[PDB]
Amino acid sequence: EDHLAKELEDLNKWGLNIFNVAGYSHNRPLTCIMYAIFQERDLLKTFRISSDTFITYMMTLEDHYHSDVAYHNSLHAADVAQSTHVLLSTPALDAVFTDLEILAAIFAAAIHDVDHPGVSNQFLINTNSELALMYNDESVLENHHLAVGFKLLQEEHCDIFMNLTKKQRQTLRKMVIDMVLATDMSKHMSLLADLKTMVETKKVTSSGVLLLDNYTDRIQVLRNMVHCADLSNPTKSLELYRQWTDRIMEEFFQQGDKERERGMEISPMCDKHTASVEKSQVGFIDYIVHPLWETWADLVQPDAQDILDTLEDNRNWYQSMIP
Numbered sequence: 001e002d003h004l005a006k007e008l009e010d011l012n013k014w015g016l017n018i019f020n021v022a023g024y025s026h027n028r029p030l031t032c033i034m035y036a037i038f039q040e041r042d043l044l045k046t047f048r049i050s051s052d053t054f055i056t057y058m059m060t061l062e063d064h065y066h067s068d069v070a071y072h073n074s075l076h077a078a079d080v081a082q083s084t085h086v087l088l089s090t091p092a093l094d095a096v097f098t099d100l101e102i103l104a105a106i107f108a109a110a111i112h113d114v115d116h117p118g119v120s121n122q123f124l125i126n127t128n129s130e131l132a133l134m135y136n137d138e139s140v141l142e143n144h145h146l147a148v149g150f151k152l153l154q155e156e157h158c159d160i161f162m163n164l165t166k167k168q169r170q171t172l173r174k175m176v177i178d179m180v181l182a183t184d185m186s187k188h189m190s191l192l193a194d195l196k197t198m199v200e201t202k203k204v205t206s207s208g209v210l211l212l213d214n215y216t217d218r219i220q221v222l223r224n225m226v227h228c229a230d231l232s233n234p235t236k237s238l239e240l241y242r243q244w245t246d247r248i249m250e251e252f253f254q255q256g257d258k259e260r261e262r263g264m265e266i267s268p269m270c271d272k273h274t275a276s277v278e279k280s281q282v283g284f285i286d287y288i289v290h291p292l293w294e295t296w297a298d299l300v301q302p303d304a305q306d307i308l309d310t311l312e313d314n315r316n317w318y319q320s321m322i323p
């Protein structure tokens, strides 16, 4: 209904409530937001993407995100897609990226977890799943998400990049593959390290806008932008954050149950009989989220200062929730 329209006024804002748009769009947050983002950024016009075609692709793609998986469903793709769209508008990165690179980043966030089964890369590897076998144990899930996302474009009624040149399609394919592969947690510590080297030698301009040399520097900041967007839950308002926690602990605990049935060794954060939902977030923020966002904030200061404050407040609420 028109309640949806009210919520899409916050499209360019960090405050968007993606759960709300899910509720007013026949449970299709990803389609919705992607359409809203491409209209807002004039991407359909710039790349001559038929409107009809874009909807069908997005619906098909959203259909491959398993609705019966607690966290890694279409809601999350929509959320990362929207956050990426906001982080892309940050003052420090103004006019830094071409419209092909902007298209690549959002498109990447939208397919970045498509067909997620609800278990980790590690689980699939230790159970010899067809997927681990297929991908030789290296970034199993992410390689797959990319495989599905691009398999869906091998059709006339679904190929949105039909009016991109040979070079434009390849130049985007290359960037998208890189962004989604960077969302693999095992690559997190090395990613944060290369982001720290970027900040060390950061060169802005007179207007406080970063000067990026070539592809190597632009794709590096995009990889980290999508990665931050993936780890953005604890920077959102407390109401939205606690709900995400509930959803990721649901998915994790079901993987813990699945592991217990098969007789494997049950991980600590996946065990519903000893894990503290509250200590899980404190630690998640101290060693993973804050170090990353503290570095990103340094890269674009003071644009991400409001987020950094929200993250400490969110962290402290979770800390006081523990006795």
Ligand SMILES: CCOC(=O)c1c(C)nn(-c2ccccc2Cl)c1C
Pocket: 185, 230, 231, 233, 234, 241, 244, 245, 248, 280, 281, 284
């Ligand atoms: C919303 C709170 O987030 C988490 O606790 C959390 C943890 C811990 N691991 N993950 C996670 C799960 C799958 C892929 C990437 C990440 Cl960061 C998430 C989302």
Ligand SMILES: [Mg+2]
Pocket: 112, 113, 183, 184
């Ligand atoms: Mg992922």
Ligand SMILES: [Zn+2]
Pocket: 076, 080, 112, 113, 183, 230
């Ligand atoms: Zn994700």
